[model samples]
Target: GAKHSSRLEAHLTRDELRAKALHIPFPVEKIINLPVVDFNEMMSKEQFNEAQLALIRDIRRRGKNKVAAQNCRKRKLENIV
Candidate 1:
């Protein structure tokens, strides 16, 4: 079950829509793509309220899951072929 919507447009993905909805200060890319050190540094230096911080963490989790899902699908497709 996906936390966000399943339908994605050509231009926007689920995380981006959620980021915009929550008024996250950083791009979803930065939130999901940053290394652990960098993400923690940004968290320590930047001023995000508790909710934003929670959502940021959740977004990263889901972002990783999304990649994992893609690879799983690719592997399954290969198996079928």
Candidate 2:
């Protein structure tokens, strides 16, 4: 059941795509990677639902890892040069 759910999720993982098809509680790109600031000022911010975090984090992780990969590749090229 869990494996099937993840596979389904992977196929439905496009944030912008989902936004167009159905309305989301929060802005997709706004919270995707909010710099994860401290909760000091969270009182004034909009709340997030559990399901929403799942989608947001999944998207954030992809971009974050892409950045890490780019950095690693750049470093390897730098070392060679």
Candidate 3:
């Protein structure tokens, strides 16, 4: 992919905005990808509410499902000559 010559701040996803609303101290990537422990930290450390915690799960599920979908398609096609 071509490098972005502009600031990344200019292009924020709605999901990112959702995470940002909670005053998350770290980058949103932490929310998008992590195990159960990370979720616990967000709740105890940042004191995120139920709604905030749900957003992380949504982001994680979407990201994971997207990659899984592509892998499934590729795997199906590869078996063909």
Candidate 4:
């Protein structure tokens, strides 16, 4: 079962953090990989599109699971301290 109260609490904490960081504008350009492009020069647009789509799908899948795990750890710490 989803712990709705904990979810709300976590979301509220996230909102507070976001509010504090609101004025900090994120850069449009990628900081680590400035000019993000395919490693292979021969990679076609279709191939690049497919690769990016796959990457995004994997990221979304893992991101949700990671967030839940992180929330559990955060809640545990909140209870402890």
Candidate 5:
């Protein structure tokens, strides 16, 4: 595969792409967006396989890391300004 930067409209977030690749039925958005309380509740309700459950947990951590990185960047900019 060639590595070229291209602007394509239909793009998936890294975690979302992983979920798609694994054929996980759950939505990545919900996996990352939902609060811990609701997320646990949803998990209890669903019949996700072991792999799916593990993937969901990993994606949630990645999502948190992404937000934390953005927040740290914003804070650094604020301190500079």
Candidate 6:
């Protein structure tokens, strides 16, 4: 029998948002409009604080995980490769 591997996927829910806040060094006003694309743009525009940039990257990575789950469900993981 051919075996298939299943990945345990995790998405960023409300709880994840709260958990992510713990990694941030300073208080953030809002993250609603702050997508990874926006964060990358901010970094390219000018120099940002290292801590803040790291926070952005963390949030982005979580968001990417959620997207990966969706893609996996749709059998589109190859696109990610």
Q: Per-residue alpha-carbon lDDT of model 5 for 1-81, expressed as tens digits?
A: 323431121125566666766666556777766678866875888767777778888777665656554435444553465
Off by over 4 Å in 2: 1-14, 19-33, 38-44, 66-81
Q: List the residue pairs that clash in candidate 6.
A: none
Model 6 Cα RMSD, 1 decimal: 13.9
Q: Compute the lDDT of residue 68 as modeled in candidate 2.
A: 57
Backbone clashes per model, in order? Answer: 0, 0, 0, 0, 0, 0
| Candidate 1 residue 44 C-alpha distance from true site, Å | 0.7
| Clashing residue pairs for model 3 | none
TM-score ranking from best to worst?
1, 5, 3, 2, 6, 4
Cα lDDT of model 4 by residue, 1-81, tens digit: 454563222423443233223321211111112222431221333333444444433333443344454445344554465
TM-score of candidate 2 on Cα atoms, chains taken together: 0.37
Model 5 misses residue 24 by how many Å? 2.4
Per-residue lDDT over 3-38 for candidate 2, one digit per residue giving the tens place of the 0 to 100 score = 455332232346655642433443445545545562
TM-score of 1: 0.53
lDDT of 3 by residue, 1-81 (tens): 443632243225555655667444455565567666876775667766777667767776665555554435354664576
- Candidate 5 backbone collisions, by pair: none
Clashing residue pairs in candidate 2 (N, C-alpha, C atoms within 3 angstroms):
none
Q: Give the range of the ten consecutive residues with the poorest summed lDDT in model 5.
A: 2-11
Q: Give all TM-scores, in the order shown.
A: 0.53, 0.37, 0.47, 0.23, 0.52, 0.34
User: Of the candidates shown, which would achieve the greatest lDDT relative to the real structure?
Assistant: 1
> In angstroms, how far off is 31's CA in candidate 3?
1.3
Model 3 quality (TM-score): 0.47
Best by TM-score: 1
